[PDB]
Amino acid sequence: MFEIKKICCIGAGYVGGPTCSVIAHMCPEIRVTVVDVNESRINAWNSPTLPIYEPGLKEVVESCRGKNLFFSTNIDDAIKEADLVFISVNTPTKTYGMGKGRAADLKYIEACARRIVQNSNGYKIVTEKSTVPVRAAESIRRIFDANTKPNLNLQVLSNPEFLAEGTAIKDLKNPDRVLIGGDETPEGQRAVQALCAVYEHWVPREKILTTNTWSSELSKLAANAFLAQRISSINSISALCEATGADVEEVATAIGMDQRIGNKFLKASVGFGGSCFQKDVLNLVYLCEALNLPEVARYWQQVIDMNDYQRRRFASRIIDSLFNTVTDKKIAILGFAFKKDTGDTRESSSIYISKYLMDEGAHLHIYDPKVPREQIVVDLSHDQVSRLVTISKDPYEACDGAHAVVICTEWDMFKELDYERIHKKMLKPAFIFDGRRVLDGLHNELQTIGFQIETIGKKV
Amino acid sequence: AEGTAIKDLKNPDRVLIGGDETPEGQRAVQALCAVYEHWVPREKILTTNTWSSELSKLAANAFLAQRISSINSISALCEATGADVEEVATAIGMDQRIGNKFLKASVGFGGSCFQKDVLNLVYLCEALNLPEVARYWQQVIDMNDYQRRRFASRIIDSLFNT
Amino acid sequence: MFEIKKICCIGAGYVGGPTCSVIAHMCPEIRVTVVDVNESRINAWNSPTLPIYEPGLKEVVESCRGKNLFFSTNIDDAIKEADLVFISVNTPTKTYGMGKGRAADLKYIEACARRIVQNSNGYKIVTEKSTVPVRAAESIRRIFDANTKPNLNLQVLSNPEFLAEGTAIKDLKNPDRVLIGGDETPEGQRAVQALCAVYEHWVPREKILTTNTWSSELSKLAANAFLAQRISSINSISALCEATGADVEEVATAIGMDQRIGNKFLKASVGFGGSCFQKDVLNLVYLCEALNLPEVARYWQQVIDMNDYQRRRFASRIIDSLFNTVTDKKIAILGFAFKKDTGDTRESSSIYISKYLMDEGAHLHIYDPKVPREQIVVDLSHDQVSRLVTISKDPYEACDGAHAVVICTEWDMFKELDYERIHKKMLKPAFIFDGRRVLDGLHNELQTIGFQIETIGKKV
Numbered sequence A, C: 001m002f003e004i005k006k007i008c009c010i011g012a013g014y015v016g017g018p019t020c021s022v023i024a025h026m027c028p029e030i031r032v033t034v035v036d037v038n039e040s041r042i043n044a045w046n047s048p049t050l051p052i053y054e055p056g057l058k059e060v061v062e063s064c065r066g067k068n069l070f071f072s073t074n075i076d077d078a079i080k081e082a083d084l085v086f087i088s089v090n091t092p093t094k095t096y097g098m099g100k101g102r103a104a105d106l107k108y109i110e111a112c113a114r115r116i117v118q119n120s121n122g123y124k125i126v127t128e129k130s131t132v133p134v135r136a137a138e139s140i141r142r143i144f145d146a147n148t149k150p151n152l153n154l155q156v157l158s159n160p161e162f163l164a165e166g167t168a169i170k171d172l173k174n175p176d177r178v179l180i181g182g183d184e185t186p187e188g189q190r191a192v193q194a195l196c197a198v199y200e201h202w203v204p205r206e207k208i209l210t211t212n213t214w215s216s217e218l219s220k221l222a223a224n225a226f227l228a229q230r231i232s233s234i235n236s237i238s239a240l241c242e243a244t245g246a247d248v249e250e251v252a253t254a255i256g257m258d259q260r261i262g263n264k265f266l267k268a269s270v271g272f273g274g275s276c277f278q279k280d281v282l283n284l285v286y287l288c289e290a291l292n293l294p295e296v297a298r299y300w301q302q303v304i305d306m307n308d309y310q311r312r313r314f315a316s317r318i319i320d321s322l323f324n325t326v327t328d329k330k331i332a333i334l335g336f337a338f339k340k341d342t343g344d345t346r347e348s349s350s351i352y353i354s355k356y357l358m359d360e361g362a363h364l365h366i367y368d369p370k371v372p373r374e375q376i377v378v379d380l381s382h383d384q385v386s387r388l389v390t391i392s393k394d395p396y397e398a399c400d401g402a403h404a405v406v407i408c409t410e411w412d413m414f415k416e417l418d419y420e421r422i423h424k425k426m427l428k429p430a431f432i433f434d435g436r437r438v439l440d441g442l443h444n445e446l447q448t449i450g451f452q453i454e455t456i457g458k459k460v
Numbered sequence B: 001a002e003g004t005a006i007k008d009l010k011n012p013d014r015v016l017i018g019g020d021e022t023p024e025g026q027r028a029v030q031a032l033c034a035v036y037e038h039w040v041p042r043e044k045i046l047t048t049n050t051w052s053s054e055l056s057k058l059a060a061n062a063f064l065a066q067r068i069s070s071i072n073s074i075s076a077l078c079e080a081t082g083a084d085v086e087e088v089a090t091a092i093g094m095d096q097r098i099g100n101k102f103l104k105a106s107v108g109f110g111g112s113c114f115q116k117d118v119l120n121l122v123y124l125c126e127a128l129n130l131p132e133v134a135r136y137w138q139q140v141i142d143m144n145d146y147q148r149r150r151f152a153s154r155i156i157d158s159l160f161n162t
């Protein structure tokens, strides 16, 4: 039996970082090196404050860094030395050309493949580990099939990651299932077994699914789409609730007790964010079009268009409540991260909402406990940002003289705020726009304070 | 044709002279006719009126361009079904009523003629209230656009779309 | 070295009859039996007057019928006793279901296949022989693959006939090329060689093209469409001639002198007919739609649309020239066959011109030299045929008392008609609509006679 003794992971991001830190923690007798071109990101991994916020991540890293888990920019030597090589890079969507704005760019995957071949001899297992794998494993394989050395035997595997940011550690420590794709050769099932034995250190065997490379990638795509679909479906219902005086939260509860539907992912919101769902459905639509499946394409397209509609519907409500003129009005934006417990803003609903108010010439004051100030200004760019955007150091500086408070992220702190204090120094009418349903049950207090609280999935 | 101009001029298939159907006229056509008679045999010189000459040219270039586009369309169909357009072009070409010339499938036709010529024929037909005829010849340009674009996509595709 | 001694042909049509008759004539020592379900048709092939009209066929057929060539209707024994079996039946366009009015119905090709399997043992070569082969060869093989007997070895070849009705004998005696398709196996190439040897009795080696089954059918589909395209291209130009004042016969000559284009199939007409051209193009469009090639389907569609327009334009001119009514007006239709020297009416533009005029209330008088009376009545209906349609025994009958004469078929004899006699008895002004250009050079004669002679590709 082949035993993985040394692991190398190209990509030290939200996926590779936490994944390898867990692998190393659960597997003391196997050396894990995480590598990356980003010198800044690598140094942070080796420091007291990590480059990404993720609850419980620190304690995991600090228990095996320097012992068992390593972070290096020396990508060559880590590739040369390893039995398993994870490729966990990002695939940004093409900004030009055919597929512009929709299809994923595989250049970094391709580049990594080329670099593996350069720095590899003998047997190595190369596993593609991403959140939205788009023809990835086949791209790697195509590089490996075309650039061969003597005694170079590289096996390509697919191993899509299911963790969700904010809950990475729990998800990795206790996953619903691990999925591994690998060719139906004996060569083949041997490489699959090797990685399968790595997971077996902490994942029960019954939760490890092994299939072929494509079926693996297509499963990931669909699972992602199904998840995005639940949020878009409930958000569609939220529109319908506001229009008819019912409550989306009660509706959602009645929906979710049907054990066939389930009660997860039915929290209506301003719209789904994150570097996964949109990228995922857009690539699924693209694939379908490429395969002459206009019907399938058309069906999944609805998940994005519903998300897009949810965002504009919510922005429009804010503008509306402000007599359709927000020029030179102070408005607090509470929460920027796409999700609570993360510093990640990729495709965050907060970016879109902010831009819609920007176009209306609002003076925005953005607060987020974890998103770095610099990131916020990059996200809201390409002179207009200098005019309209201020980054508040605490929420109260944000609502000091604001016309409206816009809650976009379900940080638990936003429930704890002193709404007595905030209302006293706001210009009236004072609006709170709750895009997360965080302030549910506080409605009566807020109304008797003097707010006019508007939330999604419920209108008076 | 450019690239074989000297051959084509020394030994043309036909020469085409359009003049007014007056006697003034036919005297003008004969003089020019007599310039070409220096190397061109008399039964290779066609004499007609002005417009009948200009329409025949337009048609003539349109008919050739259509040849390329038709075989190009077949090329697409071959790629979808595992045949060879060169083998098909042979079988088609051997029919003496079709002719074997100008059936070489390609990335698409170029030249200062064909595209300008077809689009003009279209425009004329639209002006004369013949939308049926316009739509017909417009398919020669559209197929050519398609062939080029299909070729461009295959390159991009094969390089992982990046 | 397998040699063919006994040939059975299923289909005693315009393809099957003439083809096998020539094969019999050119190859004395090989017995050729032609079979059909249609008793009437077979009795006729055995009698003094044949079921179809084809210049020269009478001599070919009577020189070897009963020596070497037979007609049977006993399909079962002919199949059983044969080395090579042609399938030359018709494939009507579907009248219902998906592909209605466009796609070819393979119900006869399949039923044939099925009967061969029932009556066959040992080795036999089965060749599909048609004008428009649409997935023919595959269908057969699909039937044979699934219905195997012990020691049955059936080979499927493709062999599209290029004969043109009217000149069938000449074409079969001296074809431009012969096209045989068979599997690129050795089983295989041997059946192709054995059919190749049939033709090598009168067709030289380098005129016989041998490719694979599908290539062969695609080659025929394409060739038919290219020829159809020439007719439509010149017909389009004819429309342009009429609005601008030039001559399509003259413009066609200028075109034809270009050896790259060639001077054949540049005769403008009322609209191409026959069981081939339209069926071929519609099936090419349908195939393309099924392979997701909209652009290619859109391209060849124009060949049909243009032909339709040619027919419709010519018709409008007739009603236009007769003061926009033909109600209770006598009109002569000269020529009903799709082309000259044949009895065949399938898809004839005469059928269309006649119907269009009847819908406007014209009392028509039809004459054709070789089309049977009964055929004309079928074609023209689906009772209104009782009121409006008379069938004339000679041209001069059709013309006596008539307001107009429409020529739809380029019969040679039409040039030779006595026009002084025809004018004398017509109602004035008398019109001649030449939809075939057969009366060029006769213009002056006919105008001076007093006619108003309107022809396609030239306007007054």
Ligand SMILES: O=c1ccn([C@@H]2O[C@H](COP(=O)(O)OP(=O)(O)O[C@H]3O[C@H](CO)[C@@H](O)[C@H](O)[C@H]3O)[C@@H](O)[C@H]2O)c(=O)[nH]1
Binding pocket: A131, A132, A161, A162, A163, A164, A165, A224, A227, A231, A264, A265, A266, A267, A268, A269, A270, A271, A272, A273, A274, A275, A276, A277, A338, A339, A340
């Ligand atoms: O009922 C819900 C559920 C989620 N969200 C939002 O959905 C987005 C995505 O959230 P979440 O799925 O928790 O975070 P991700 O990091 O995107 O994780 C998902 O995306 C990963 C990438 O595909 C998958 O691997 C995980 O399995 C899947 O949970 C966020 O903007 C959430 O605010 C809400 O709108 N309502």
Ligand SMILES: O=c1ccn([C@@H]2O[C@H](COP(=O)(O)OP(=O)(O)O[C@H]3O[C@H](CO)[C@@H](O)[C@H](O)[C@H]3O)[C@@H](O)[C@H]2O)c(=O)[nH]1
Binding pocket: B001, B002, B061, B064, B068, B101, B102, B103, B104, B105, B106, B107, B108, B109, B110, B111, B112, B113, B114
């Ligand atoms: O089988 C072929 C033949 C040509 N081409 C292409 O078609 C374009 C035009 O070809 P060609 O006709 O040889 O060049 P031209 O100089 O445009 O000449 C044509 O056009 C002239 C008007 O420009 C006419 O006068 C000529 O008679 C006619 O041959 C070129 O890009 C060729 O490569 C093909 O793709 N396939």
Ligand SMILES: O=c1ccn([C@@H]2O[C@H](COP(=O)(O)OP(=O)(O)O[C@H]3O[C@H](CO)[C@@H](O)[C@H](O)[C@H]3O)[C@@H](O)[C@H]2O)c(=O)[nH]1
Binding pocket: C131, C161, C162, C163, C164, C165, C224, C227, C231, C264, C265, C266, C267, C268, C269, C270, C271, C272, C273, C274, C275, C276, C277, C338, C339
């Ligand atoms: O210059 C022309 C030539 C033909 N036609 C018309 O088009 C029709 C078809 O004529 P033709 O092609 O000779 O008769 P087919 O029996 O259909 O034969 C053609 O189609 C056959 C299959 O049907 C092929 O096998 C032959 O190769 C091909 O010549 C007739 O109605 C003609 O009047 C024109 O209008 N103008």
